[PDB]
RNA sequence: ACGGGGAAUCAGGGUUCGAUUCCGGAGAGGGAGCCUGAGAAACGGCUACCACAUCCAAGGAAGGCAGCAGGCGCGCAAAUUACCCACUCCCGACCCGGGGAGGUAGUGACGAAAAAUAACAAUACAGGACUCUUUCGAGGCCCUGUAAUUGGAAUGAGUCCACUUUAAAUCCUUUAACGAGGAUCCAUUGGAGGGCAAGUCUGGUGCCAGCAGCCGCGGUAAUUCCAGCUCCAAUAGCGUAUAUUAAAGUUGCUGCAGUUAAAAAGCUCGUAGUUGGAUCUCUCUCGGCCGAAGCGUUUACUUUGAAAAAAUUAGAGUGUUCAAAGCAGGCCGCCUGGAUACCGCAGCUAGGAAUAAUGGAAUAGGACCGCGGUUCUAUUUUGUUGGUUUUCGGAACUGAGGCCAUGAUUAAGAGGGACGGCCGGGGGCAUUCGUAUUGCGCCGCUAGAGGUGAAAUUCUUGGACCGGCGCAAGACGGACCAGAGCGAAAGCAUUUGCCAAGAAUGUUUUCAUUAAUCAAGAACGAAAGUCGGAGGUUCGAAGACGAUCAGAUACCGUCGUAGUUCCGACCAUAAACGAUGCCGACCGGCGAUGCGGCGGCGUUAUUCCCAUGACCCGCCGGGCAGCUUCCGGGAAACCAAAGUCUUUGGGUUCCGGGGGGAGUAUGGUUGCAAAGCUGAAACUUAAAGGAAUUGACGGAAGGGCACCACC
RNA sequence: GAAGACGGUCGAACUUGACUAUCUAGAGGAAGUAAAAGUCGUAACAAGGUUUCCGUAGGUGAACCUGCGGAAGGAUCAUUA
């Protein structure tokens, strides 16, 4: 059941049992990594690079071809962002709710909807401070967030 | 009563109250000044 | 959320002996489920079962005999010294003749009659009769 | 449902000792406010001095006059209406007499017919009422 | 509240008591200060002060029972101003003296153990039973007694010489002598309606006296009071009062409840707490192959060990005359015993390695190897002796190279975040339309119009209502509108645009446990109401009138302030309801419905084709619901959850404990206030209450009938 | 080597303030309690003669009444293209 919603919805991806790279795929792991470096130099997230190779280049799982997954390729080449992918998209979303909120003060919908985006940020910042992906003094302050994204 | 010392005090006043009232009539009889200690004796 | 996978996999096979079925599906399986199920099978309560291996966490299909009255879990797994096993098997079992308490000792997941021989305490996992 | 962890004994032990307070049998014996309100102070019996013989009326569906006695207790000065039990047992009592009083039997509640009377006379003038009623002894003056 | 050892109760879990004879603490009327001494802040030592108080010749002197006795006072509540160092032990110069320590008696129904108040025989029964007689009735064959029938045989309780006991006595044990027939050498305390064993027998009283824990009894026939008889229960004991334990699964860990009986917070976020998905099969330097020393990441768990005062508790042995006890005893000088278990948590120890927490390398300043450098430096080496320099030894730090099968568990029918096409009376801002109502302008024809069960208050030629054209003002968005949709809940419907959110679905994307529930703390919160402005169309608390009425200060009708509308603050409550906490799994059918995806005959439109829409037939996922059913529950009504519950344990929050007093009083806190939150007790009651049944009643309906009904 | 003094320290206690707490004499009135079978309506239970109940504001002889907004624990589980 979804965290800050009353919906108990079931929709996801179903990975197959056969874990091997299939027969027709004529891309080696070095060629896939070379594709990933260009698609990251274009300025895409790890969640967007895995889509482009699936749709156009026919790569089902990059973890199945290369042996490593997407983020551990970019963080080993060096072309990786400091704050992670999902924490960025929450901080960037809480900016646009907060930016729109100074225009319309009476909107008590997005005033409630800001706290849910707020309370998801501290759930992730706690996790990243625990796993030491973030420095242990990083805090979300509501005024500096226009220069974090 | 309130708090163990104003209960021990409260007992001491009422102990002193009773213990002094029982003495205000004890000297009614047979002191050194001595209205004599009248003892009537009868056999049954 | 699913706290206690052994709890949901025993009330899945409790609720189907009621309804008269001959097979259960119990997903997901841990290996505490397979040890517990093997103790019930060795005392004739269950019969043969098959572990379906998807790459995630297995499911089990268990063929049922009609011999199990009750299958239960104790939560939390209290610690049971061997001098305190009689109170447990008097609160949980229907008689002195049948029924078993499963506890996880350091010599393996076993009965209460096995744990008395090998002279071992453990933590109580559950019971069946 | 109840909490059921293995480290939850402080939640368990302290929920009970707050929930114990809603038990009126628990509270009336642990709060202390009903033992300073008790006229005896937690004694089985007490002595007193008869002020007058007030006789009080029975309750609703049955009619008589219960003969009682207004007692003023020695050890704390409190006043008490106690019930003189058998028949012809008010006729062993005069005023200003010293009376050992008991409870009635319901531990500080009234006993059915009599309204608001929680005590009964046991001995008058240091002789027993069962000794006077059954004629075993004589009333001492 | 001195703490423990322990005590009561108890299926298992528990609960309550522990002043009290053993261990430890403290204190000698209340605080304080000392002397002496190995040891005291000592009180059967001293010095003060505060409190009491004794003598006195008035100048002075002496005090400390919570030692043993004893007294007063207090109280429901507790023994002798007795004898002795003989026992157990202690002190002293000590085999010798002393000890209210202690022992022995006295008082003692605290309490616990044993245990009398009669046994037997012969007769007789208008007693029973066994063998025969069809039955009358025949018998020492066995039993019984409302036989105060007879009869001896037995014995203590007492009375009492003697011994024994003891320090001396008592008591018990042992023995003389006396000692039982209504064996008057009399057994009592509560009861006889039900709970609950046992009399609707007789007399008295007549809702009186009184009984009765509770229900109830008593108003002239009382099964219940006052008594007589008879019967019952325990029995040298039995009632009563109060504390407490069980009964109480009515405090619930085991093990309760929360739709309607008492009770789920209005909704949501959230820190602490509590709980958390799969996954991984002992070796180096020495001593005689066997011991040291190290571990390995740290623990929880479990098993063993050793340490845990005695007494108590459990339990072994033992004929105290039995027993409660005791630690004694037994054999014809000897032979014995004085065991043992239990002794939570915490701390030591050793084995196990399942479960549960935790580490171990991911910008490799990573493991194992041998290679080189820099700094310090061991102490043996040169027959001893002073000086130099190596080697090695042991550390500490850097640079290459080899080698690692070199090092990332999966991707949860857990969760977050991308992305995709949709969807919705979700939210905010701007804009737009609609008829109506009220008011106004003008025209028309005219005396009525409004409202009611009836009227009346009210507007009318200072022309009402009605038909027509316009103008404005503010309010509200029908029918379409559904047991449909969205929203965290309150809540949300005209057009159009803008702005920022969201669910569900689809996915061979991504991160990889990030989660569930939640003190504290926080956001939103219908209606009403309070401070400030703006506007006032309808409606309208309060108020004024008219009517109905025995009476109306209400229902009904006409006016009508605050309000109802807009914005800035507050308020934080509702029958805020599904009267139903959230997360998770399993458990029957059926047909519809909304949104998204997938497959499929065949009809319409975009002219024919593709694609899309509209249908039609299915399938999948998630939603609001419905019908149904011997799934199972429930006191039922009923509920597919209110199921999976004595076959009781998936996680977790709140919260109830007979009815009243009372959501009151007080205290704190919040508020402009209104009020909100938190929240008693004294006393008072034996029922209050939930579902369902059968009547009865209805100024509730449907139907039906009668000249004791009408027409 | 006694009396006695200076100074230090320990500290009982005394005096007066403040905060209290408790024992004690006094008109006035205050609230609940023991009953009450005393008088006027009949709010409620039937559609209880204005369905009832909930919150919230206002007014009274009072049970209450009325304005707003809910709920059915209602007197409808339903009203026709």
What whole-number distance in Å separates Cα of residue A98 and Cα of residue A90?
A: 12
Same domain, A92 and A116: yes
3-state SS assignment for residue A117 = helix
Could you tell me the distance in Å between the CA of residue D89 and the C1' of nucleotide E203? 24
Q: Is residue A17 part of a domain?
A: no
Bases of chain E below 7 A from a protein C-beta are 12-13, 73-77, 190, 207-219, 225-226, 240-244, 250-256, 258, 264, 268-271, 273-280, 301-304, 351-356, 362-364, 408, 410-419, 426-429, 488-489, 499-516, 523-525, 567-568, 581-588, 621-623, 631-632, 643-645, 647-658, 681-686
Same domain, C19 and C78: no
Same domain, A71 and A109: no
Residue C28 lies in domain: 1-68
Contact C39, C110 (CB under 8 A): yes
Q: Which residues contact D6 (CB under 8 A, 6 or more apart)?
A: C76, C77, C78
Same domain, A59 and A98: no
Chain C residues whose C-beta sits inside 8 Å of any chain A C-beta: 54-55
Total count of domains within chain D: 1
Residues of A in contact with C54 (CB under 8 A): 17
What whole-number distance in Å separates Cα of residue B29 and Cα of residue B35?
A: 7
| Residue C90, CA distances (Å) to A60, C10, C49, C87, D12 in order | 57, 21, 30, 5, 25
Residue A54 lies in domain: 26-80
Bases of chain F below 7 A from a protein C-beta are 21-24, 33-36
Smallest CA–C1' separation from B1, nucleotide? F22
Total count of domains within chain C: 2
What whole-number distance in Å separates Cα of residue A17 and Cα of residue D14?
A: 52
Rg (CA), chain B: 19
Q: Which residues contact D99 (CB under 8 A, 6 or more apart)?
A: D47, D48, D49, D50, D69, D71, D82, D93, D121, D122, D123, D124
| Residue B19, CA distances (Å) to B24, B27, C51, D49, D113 in order | 10, 14, 92, 20, 42
Residue D115 lies in domain: 1-141
Task: Evaluate if the CB of D60 falls below 7 Å from strand F.
Answer: yes
Task: Evaluate if the CB of D89 falls below 7 Å from strand E.
Answer: yes
Same domain, A95 and A125: yes
User: Which residue places its CA closest to the C1' of nucleotide E568?
Assistant: A106
Same domain, A89 and A148: yes
Contact A124, A85 (CB under 8 A): no
What whole-number distance in Å separates Cα of residue D81 and Cα of residue D119?
A: 7
Contact A121, A140 (CB under 8 A): yes
What whole-number distance in Å separates Cα of residue D90 and Cα of residue D103?
A: 18
Q: Is residue A8 part of a domain?
A: no
Same domain, C81 and C38: no
Q: Which residue has the tokens 């093997």?
A: C38
Same domain, A56 and A100: no
Q: Is residue A13 part of a domain?
A: no
Experimental method: cryo-EM
Same domain, C76 and C53: no
Same domain, C35 and C78: no
| Residue D82, CA distances (Å) to A10, A43, D100 in order | 77, 97, 10
Same domain, C57 and C91: no
Chains contacting B (3 or more CB pairs within 8 Å): none
Total count of domains within chain A: 2
Task: Evaluate if the CB of A123 falls below 7 Å from strand E.
Answer: yes
3-state SS assignment for residue C128 = strand
Check residues 25 to 44 of chain C and report those whose beta carbon is under 7 Å from nucleic acid strand E: 25, 27-32
What whole-number distance in Å separates Cα of residue A2 and Cα of residue A91?
A: 20
Pick the last residue of a domain from C26, C41, C68: C68
Same domain, A66 and A97: no
Do residue D4 and residue C75 have CB atoms under 8 angstroms apart? yes
Same domain, C60 and C73: no
Residue C20 — φ and ψ, nearest 5°? Answer: 85, 10
């Amino acid at each position: 059941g979804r965290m800050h919603a009353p919906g108990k919805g079931l929709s996801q991806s179903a990975l197959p049992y056969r874990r091997s790279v299939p027969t027709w795929l004529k891309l080696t792991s070095d060629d896939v990594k070379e594709q990933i470096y260009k698609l990251a130099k274009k300025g895409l997230t790890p969640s967007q690079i895995g889509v482009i190779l699936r749709d156009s280049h026919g790569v089902a799982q990059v973890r199945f071809v290369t042996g490593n997954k997407i983020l551990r390729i970019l963080k080993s080449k060096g072309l990786a962002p400091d704050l992670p992918e999902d924490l960025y998209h929450l901080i960037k979303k809480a900016v646009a709710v907060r930016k729109h909120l100074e225009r319309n003060r009476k909107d008590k919908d997005a005033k409630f909807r800001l706290i849910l985006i707020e309370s998801r940020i501290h759930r992730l910042a706690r996790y990243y401070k625990t796993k030491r992906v973030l420095p242990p003094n990083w805090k979300y302050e509501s005024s500096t967030a226009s220069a974090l994204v | 009563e309130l708090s163990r010392v104003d209960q021990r005090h409260r007992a001491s006043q009422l102990r002193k109250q009773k213990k002094e009232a029982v003495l205000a009539e004890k000297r009614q009889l047979g002191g050194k000044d001595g209205p004599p200690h009248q003892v009537l004796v009868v056999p049954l | 959320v699913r706290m206690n996978v052994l709890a949901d996999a025993l009330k899945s096979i409790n609720n189907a002996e009621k309804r008269g079925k001959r097979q259960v599906l119990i997903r997901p399986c841990s290996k505490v489920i397979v040890r517990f199920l093997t103790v019930m099978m060795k005392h004739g309560y269950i019969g043969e079962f098959e572990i379906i291996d998807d790459h995630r966490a297995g499911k089990i299909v268990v063929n049922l005999t009609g011999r199990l009255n009750k299958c239960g879990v104790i939560s939390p797994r209290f610690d049971v010294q061997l001098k305190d096993l009689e109170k447990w098997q008097n609160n949980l079992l229907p008689s002195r003749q049948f029924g078993f308490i499963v506890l996880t000792t350091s010599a393996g997941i076993m009965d209460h009659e096995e744990a008395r021989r090998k002279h071992t305490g453990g933590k109580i996992l559950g019971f069946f009769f | 449902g109840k909490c059921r962890g293995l480290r939850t004994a402080r939640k368990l032990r302290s929920h009970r000792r707050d929930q114990k307070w809603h038990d009126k049998q628990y509270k009336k014996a642990h709060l202390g406010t009903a033992l300073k309100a008790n006229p005896f102070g937690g004694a089985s019996h007490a002595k007193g001095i008869v002020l007058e013989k007030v006789g009080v009326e029975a309750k609703q569906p049955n009619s008589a006059i219960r003969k009682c006695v207004r007692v003023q207790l020695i050890k704390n000065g409190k006043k008490i209406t106690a019930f003189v039990p058998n028949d012809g047992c008010l006729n062993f009592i005069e005023e200003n007499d010293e009376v050992l009083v008991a409870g009635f039997g319901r531990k500080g509640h009234a006993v059915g017919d009599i309204p608001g009377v929680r005590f009964k006379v046991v001995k008058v003038a240091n002789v027993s009422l069962l000794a006077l009623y059954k004629g075993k002894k004589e009333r001492p003056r």
